[PDB]
Amino acid sequence: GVEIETISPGDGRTFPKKGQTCVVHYTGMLQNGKKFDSSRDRNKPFKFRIGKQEVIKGFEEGAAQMSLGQRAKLTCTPDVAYGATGHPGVIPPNATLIFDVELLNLE
């Protein structure tokens, strides 16, 4: 599955529910320590709807367990993210992913 560790605590009461839209800031790097993506570089928060297979499984499962304003770290195994095919030219096959996620706003 996915492992979640808390960096900065959040509200602790509000959680993402069905039909809502999450606005997050994230940064993703490989297990070796090499960065491959960051939404703060583009200076625009990422927005996605939960339950509509818009993103990979691990990102959604990690974001489902976080409260409003929380900042945490997520780890995803290869069978959850891109499997054995990877992302051509970006992610090699059989890679474990590490994300640093902050939840900003809901809907």
Q: Which of 20, 21, 90, 107 binds another protein (CB under 8 A)?
A: 90
Active-site residues: which are they?
A: 26, 36-37, 56, 82, 99
> Of residues 12-31, which lie at the interface with another protein (CB under 8 A)?
26, 28
Residue at 14: amino acid letter: T
Residue 98 engages another protein in binding (rule: CB under 8 A): no
Residues contacting 28, CB < 8 A, separation 6+ = 35, 36, 37, 38, 97, 98, 99, 100
CA 5 to chain centre: 13
Binding site for another protein (CB under 8 A): 7, 26, 28, 34, 36-38, 41-42, 46, 53-56, 59, 82, 85-92
